[PDB]
Amino acid sequence: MKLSEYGLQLQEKQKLRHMYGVNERQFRKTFEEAGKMPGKHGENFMILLESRLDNLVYRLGLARTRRQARQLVTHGHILVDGSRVNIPSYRVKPGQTIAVREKSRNLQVIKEALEANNYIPDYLSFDPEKMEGTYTRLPERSELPAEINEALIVEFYSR
């Protein structure tokens, strides 16, 4: 009857998993992949989940939801650092700029998400005139879901 902690640990993973829509492969992969940058492995995982090409797009205001942002990337409309990145699993890093493709600017789905913008993180600079977002810095926990805890998920790979 009383669920032990072993169940609460994976439970947390279930949430952070169906959160921004992180597939399992991208979850385990993005994981052993985050252990590359130094700075609390957990933090890294919480930093890549947002770096997701789709996340950043939706985070700014070019799409209303992942169904809208994800579709934008695939449409090779987002120009990273001035380069078409129709790859959603790709990853962006400081110094790179997210910019909507010209022909892909009258997109109603975007013109509609531009208004839905009313809260852009501090490390993301959104340019409305040229519709260009810039990764001016890395994200922090003061903005990522706080009701989440990767620890119980950290030792999970040590099992």
For residue 149, give its domain range. Answer: 1-51+140-159
Cα distance between residue 134 and residue 126, in whole Å: 7
Alpha helix positions (H), the chain: 5-18, 24-34, 41-51, 53-59, 66-74, 108-115, 151-158
Phi–psi pair at 110, nearest 5 degrees? -85, -60
Residues 64 and 46 in one domain: no
Q: How many CB atoms lie within 10 A of CB 85?
A: 18
CATH code for position 56: 3.10.290.10
Residues 77 and 22 in one domain: no
Cα distance between residue 57 and residue 91, in whole Å: 12
| Residue found under tokens 């959104």 | 126
Residues 57 and 130 in one domain: yes
Distances in Å between the alpha carbon of 8 and those of 3, 98, 127? 8, 37, 42
